[PDB]
Amino acid sequence: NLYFQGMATITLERDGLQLVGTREEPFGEIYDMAIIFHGFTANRNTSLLREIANSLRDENIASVRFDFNGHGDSDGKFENMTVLNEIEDANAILNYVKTDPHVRNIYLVGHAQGGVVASMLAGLYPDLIKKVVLLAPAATLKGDALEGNTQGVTYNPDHIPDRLPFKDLTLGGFYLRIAQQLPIYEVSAQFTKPVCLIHGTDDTVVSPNASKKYDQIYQNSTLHLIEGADHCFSDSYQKNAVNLTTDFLQ
Amino acid sequence: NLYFQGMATITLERDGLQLVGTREEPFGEIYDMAIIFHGFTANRNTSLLREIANSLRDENIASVRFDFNGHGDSDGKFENMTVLNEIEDANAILNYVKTDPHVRNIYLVGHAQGGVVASMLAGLYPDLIKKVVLLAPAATLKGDALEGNTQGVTYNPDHIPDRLPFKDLTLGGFYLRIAQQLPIYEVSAQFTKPVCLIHGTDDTVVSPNASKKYDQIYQNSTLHLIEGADHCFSDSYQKNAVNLTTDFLQ
Ligand SMILES: CCOC(=O)/C=C/c1ccc(O)c(OC)c1
Ligand SMILES: CCOC(=O)/C=C/c1ccc(O)c(OC)c1
Ligand SMILES: [Cl-]
Ligand SMILES: [Cl-]
Ligand SMILES: [Cl-]
Ligand SMILES: [Cl-]
Ligand SMILES: [N+]
Ligand SMILES: [N+]
Ligand SMILES: [N+]
Ligand SMILES: [N+]
Ligand SMILES: [N+]
Ligand SMILES: [N+]
Ligand SMILES: [N+]
Ligand SMILES: [N+]
Ligand SMILES: [N+]
Ligand SMILES: [N+]
Ligand SMILES: [N+]
Ligand SMILES: [N+]
Ligand SMILES: [N+]
Ligand SMILES: [N+]
Ligand SMILES: [N+]
Ligand SMILES: [N+]
């Protein structure tokens, strides 16, 4: 605002879970605010999401970035996380933003699974969200679940176990059952305002096809396929992903 | 079990919320178990649900019945309840039931909004649940949210407010935005094992067309129209409701 600029730690509640975020507070009385969503097994402070927030703040656009339930500093077990209770988290954060009287327009920015959270959130709030940016949005998480292969890790898609080991973590059977029947496109397509879609052509975690499908379902989308970029927009592509996002929001 | 029979109060957790229930434990080393789900604004101990759990226990079918979040003895504000978070409540209860070693077949039994919870849960666990009984399932709550008229309380369905004063209660805006888009029949229709559908013909809260519709989506359903019954299967209608429920779960 006019008196404090820079970062602050903010905590919210969603059903007796506490969610821990970082607010990037710009100069100015009135401003636009982006809610930024990290991906699966990630947290609010990846390089991509840090640089996103920072670039946004340099253009006077506020932001908040939170750890989803079961990730980062936020409460709850990873095994109990699903895309749906992430939407619930995202709604608790949308409550916080929409009641700050500094905020003018609200933007949603999500990477990977946080892109699916963003796109379905905007589809529930198409009357409130103004612009949305999706980076490598992971709608393919639904097909992976129908196939029985989530990021290497395999199961029978018709006999899903109670839990699945997944690196050093424990993934919940319910995550996968919800994943198989997520109405991603059905919900996301309710949002008819400006969408920015950024995806790397060398993404091997989430097919570019995912962004090509989002480009079909939105009537107001712009698609950027970044030649050579990976899933994380690593190395030289990160600045590319970050300027696209910033440019679009202004 | 073979040593203890009779009731107990169970406490479960879901996302930092305590869910309070009643477990009825029958005779035998091995038995089937019913999960009984109450409706919108109701609780686990309505006359109807006590009588279901009693009739079941006479057949040595075990049951549990929990207050959903925002109801009865359970945690959370009513205004923060949604059908989605009730499904998550329901999944937490299912975790408890499915991990009991005495339990053979798991049945779902849901009244009104508890019917929607039940049908959706069965659709997500079509490999685990053995049988479903829906009493006046409120699948009409979605169309009601799309029209903008929930039990006579009207609001703009394209501009859903933050909160809706709702007769001595305050229903959450996010309840309504979820309801509009819940994929009730899509998910429910994945359950291809036996379903028993029961609806009174004089229900004025949930149109009988709801049970008619399920009986069309389902690959193995049986429809019981109770001539003259009300939404809550009151007085004489209750024993008919209960017997149909009991006989079916056998
Ligand atoms: C941080 C980047 O990673 C993601 O967000 C991935 C989302 C996602 C992609 C494919 C899947 O099969 C899946 O189910 C676990 C999730
Ligand atoms: C306690 C017994 O009854 C119920 O569960 C009723 C549920 C219900 C019916 C129609 C609706 O438009 C609705 O939106 C909140 C909810
Ligand atoms: Cl699970
Ligand atoms: Cl015994
Ligand atoms: Cl009663
Ligand atoms: Cl009967
Ligand atoms: N200010
Ligand atoms: N985030
Ligand atoms: N399978
Ligand atoms: N969307
Ligand atoms: N588009
Ligand atoms: N036993
Ligand atoms: N309910
Ligand atoms: N109530
Ligand atoms: N009751
Ligand atoms: N009931
Ligand atoms: N409430
Ligand atoms: N609510
Ligand atoms: N009603
Ligand atoms: N509003
Ligand atoms: N709400
Ligand atoms: N939907």
Author numbering:
A (entry chain A), B (entry chain B): -5 to 244
Original authors' sentences:
We previously showed that LJ0536, a cinnamoyl esterase purified from L. johnsonii N6.2, is active towards a variety of substrates including short acyl chain aliphatic esters and phenolic esters. The structure showed a canonical α/β fold characteristic of esterases, and the enzyme is dimeric. Two classical serine esterase motifs (GlyXSerXGly) can be recognized from the amino acid sequence, and the structure revealed that the catalytic triad of the enzyme is formed by Ser106, His225, and Asp197, while the other motif is non-functional.
The Ser106Ala-ethyl ferulate complex crystallized in two forms (Form I and Form II with a dimer and a single chain in the asymmetric units, respectively). In all three complexes, the substrates in the catalytic groove were oriented with the aromatic acyl moiety of the carbonyl group bound in the deepest part of the pocket. The opposite end of the ligands, on the far side of the ester moiety, such as the ethoxyl group of ethyl ferulate, rests on a more solvent-exposed area of the groove and has few interactions with the protein. The 3-methoxy group of ethyl ferulate or ferulic acid is accommodated by a small hydrophobic cavity formed by the benzyl moieties of Phe34 and Phe160, plus the Leu165 residue. In addition, there was relatively poor density for the alkoxyl group, perhaps due to the lack of direct interaction with the catalytic pocket.
